[PDB]
Subunit: 215 residues, 3 copies
């Protein structure tokens, strides 16, 4: 039973950490909320999406100081995943939550990704075709609408040029990155984009850790 | 000098013994379905709502071929990510040599058709089907009622529109084809639940065919 | 610190080879130039792109004998990369330069690929949507226009049915093929297309080697 030691240790660790992370998520005080981010995005779903980004970042830094990256640590990073290609501006990211501005200037679409996190996107501009699993028809969502991609759900997404949205995700964030960079690894091979993503995520993690240390 | 190389010689011997075995089996096997049969059955219902067409096609298939089409309890729409496109399938029948399914997409997708060891026929029930054959510079658009025969060893570029639905029948060595149907699910989407669903429906169809053979 | 010798040697080798190849490319005598290919392509920017292909191949074989493959060694090879799919006709290829006719008859788009080479594409027909990195808006280019995808640059590309262009790339060509075949490896699994690409590249390399040997 010596060769079973590795497998038993792996099973024990994975189930001890499933239980640990699941109890942590059910007893942790979160910074942001899905209704909060969706409401803030709906407040500005009218004007030019750039002005919406500006006002949303201003209100976020006012209402949650020390939790949004500084303008020095902001950059649009490409995101290739599930067969679609867009760009993101990460405003906040922790081990359990993340907030970003996502969108595309080209017509793309693919797999939404099935991960251990609840994600909410409020469309600021463009169109969002969603095709839920097990169906034969898709629905199109317009600026002002908010789509909640639940945990374990998998849909087909499609966007139009100029489609932009504010996105908030809550769950176990690392387990999701495996999907967000798969195409960057096996399709685009844009390792510099991978580096940019890791860089901005590390900056958000260090910002959150510094804010925790100050308190 | 044959110790290093023993693995390579065993691999070559096995691959050629199994190419011979499989190609002799495919040339001496009585098949269940036919390309023209499925094409006619699909074209007969190409004018109705593709959902109603699906219903009537499943009924006629279970009527004319009892014991070879899955029961309604074992049917479910499984996402399919492959060649850069994304659609969904409903597997009606599948063995080691044949498969019948209802394929289509509710979003605008397109990519590589996939080159495999099987002849595949698709009859469009609704939507549009852009096909771009290899070595050409122009593409053709196929409409409901048309039937496309993707021959063995052929590779094309496919593109679909929202609401494109079709009945598809493939004949050949089915396992060697699944490698293409799940590549994006492995390296791009990582939707392992969809991988499990695919293995599930294929195993269910294989067990149904094995049970029908055992009863006979 | 004995096993740090391997890592230090690896870094030293990679930087000595970076310096070697980069100095070579900065001092090498090239056969073609981007303005030459771009002007020749713009002269024939029309609707009947096929006649443009024929006349361009004729002019290339006239002004540079022994550097363009013969009609026997020409074939349209599928190209899957970055999430898009097109087809190519390789006219010339070496270790530092390559000239081809690229295009698609279907609607595709994805990652342009970030490689160690400057690439120039002159659109003969169709439309070319380019989305530059770090921006939120995309530009649309039409037949006659020439786009220079610079070294280290990464953009999002999108094409329409019937989009065809003449492309010339200069740099370290092998390091680019890794991107050009990634989707063929992990997405399409079209090993025959991989063989065709390797075959036409080998034919071009042997043609250029024969021309060097004759001189
Ligand atoms: C986990 C993840 C999924 C994803 O997909 C694009 C967003 N939306 C998904 C659903 O609906 C359409 C668009 N991006 N992303 C990500 C990527 C990079 C990240 C970096 C730091 C923190 C979170 C980070 C999170
Ligand atoms: C082998 C294969 C190719 C494919 O591609 C989508 C269909 N068409 C292809 C050509 O034209 C456009 C659409 N699905 N598929 C498959 C996927 C899962 C399967 C599961 C069980 C049995 C056969 C199974 C077969
Ligand atoms: C390196 C590379 C990139 C590429 O991408 C498509 C062209 N364009 C790129 C930028 O803008 C849009 C379209 N093809 N390709 C290639 C593929 C095969 C090759 C074979 C031999 C020599 C060079 C060879 C070069
Ligand atoms: Au930004
Ligand atoms: Au931003
Ligand atoms: Au079904
Ligand atoms: Au069905
Ligand atoms: Au050619
Ligand atoms: Au050609």
């Amino acid at each position: 039973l010596w060769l079973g030691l590795r497998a038993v240790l792996v099973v024990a660790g994975l189930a001890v950490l499933l239980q640990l992370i699941r109890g942590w998520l059910s007893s942790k005080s979160y910074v942001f909320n899905r209704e909060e981010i969706a409401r803030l995005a709906k407040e500005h779903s009218g004007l030019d999406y750039e002005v919406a980004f500006s006002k949303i970042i201003v209100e976020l830094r006012k209402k949650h100081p020390g939790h949004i990256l500084q303008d020095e640590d902001l950059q649009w990073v490409f995101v290739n995943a599930g067969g679609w290609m867009g760009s993101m501006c990460l405003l906040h990211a922790s081990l359990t939550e993340y907030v970003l501005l996502f969108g595309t200037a080209v017509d793309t679409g693919g797999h939404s990704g099935r991960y251990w996190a609840e994600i909410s996107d409020t469309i600021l501009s463009g169109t969002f075709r969603q095709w839920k699993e097990g169906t034969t028809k898709s629905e199109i969502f317009y600026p002002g609408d908010t789509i909640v991609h639940e945990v374990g759900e998998a849909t087909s997404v499609q966007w139009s040029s100029g489609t932009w949205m504010v996105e908030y995700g809550r769950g176990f964030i690392p387990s999701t990155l495996a999907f967000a960079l798969a195409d960057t690894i096996f399709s685009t091979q844009d390792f510099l984009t991978l580096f940019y993503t890791v860089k901005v995520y590390s900056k958000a993690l260090l910002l959150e850790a510094s804010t925790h240390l100050s308190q």
